């Protein structure tokens with residue numbers, strides 16, 4: 225059973241969650257079932273993954289069979305940037321909630337800070353593959369999302385892939401009702417996010433680390449890309465504890481009080497990824513791992529660098 229990170233709202237977010245990004249239909253339902261059986265309570269979802277309906281089915285099964293109560297689950301989803309225009313925030317949220325078969329979400333995140341062309345083409349692009357921008361901004365979206373919290377449909381709001389510049393732009397908006405409770409970003413020993421975590425924490429904002437294993441499966445993997453699971457120095461630390469490299473990579477975030485969401489649909493791995501509360505990385509081991517920073521992003525996907533609120537140019 226995972227420990228928790230307390231949010232600014234006093235809600236308790238389980239520090240390990242199950243990721244569902246790229247989890248196929250016909251596997252994601254069983255993945256969520258196995259996860260809940262293994263003690264996972266936090267499940268990370270998104271509209272853009274187009275699998276929320278099967279996640280919802282799995283959650284419903286486990287609740288009606290008394291494996292878990294809704295109050296003890298922590299379900300997070302995300303608003304895609306083709307839906308930043310006011311009425312579409314509502315409609316997109318409604319489809320997410322309907323697919324998940326839930327009555328509320330625990331956290332609802334802005335998935336990406338730059339708005340795209342409004343509509344149900346999720347990846348509007350030109351001939352070169354560059355994203356087509358839209359005029360509604362993440363602040364427009366936030367305004368619409370705040371109603372969901374007013375109505376009890378969402379317990380807390382947060383952001384994802386935001387730089388500290390964009391969080392500042394959000395935090396400094398006059399007339400804000402609700403503040404972000406987390407910033408979900410890529411984080412692992414090759415991209416340690418030291419300044420962003422320090423910034424976020426200084427503002428009472430948690431960090432959720434995605435791609436903690438370096439996302440070995442990503443199709444865009446260049447053969448020369450670095451490989452965390454095969455890194456001899458990560459492997460050394462795992463051997464010392466008779467744990468796997470994956471378990472070290474996950475425990476690394478836990479000891480920084482950072483929430484972490486490893487994705488898997490393989491039952492053995494799902495179980496493995498939450499067996500991280502029976503060992504401790506020492507101070508030297510933590511320091512060694514931090515020294516691996518290469519400022520390397522696996523997940524730079526959006527050729528949206530030409531659009532206004534691009535997160536990945538700033539230092540942090």
Ligand SMILES: NC(=O)c1ccc[n+]([C@@H]2O[C@H](COP(=O)([O-])OP(=O)(O)OC[C@H]3O[C@@H](n4cnc5c(N)ncnc54)[C@H](OP(=O)(O)O)[C@@H]3O)[C@@H](O)[C@H]2O)c1
Pocket residue numbers: 242243244245246268269335384385408409433434435436437438439440441453470471485486487488489490493494496497
């Ligand atoms: N912008 C955003 O906010 C954003 C965008 C994308 C994703 N996310 C979230 O972050 C989550 C995690 O990141 P990620 O999915 O990119 O990659 P990841 O969790 O770093 O890696 C997943 C890959 O590692 C494999 N794996 C999992 N556990 C393993 C283990 N113990 N040993 C060896 N291999 C293992 C998985 O295989 P199998 O699945 O085949 O078992 C999968 O191929 C996503 O699922 C998603 O929910 C957020």
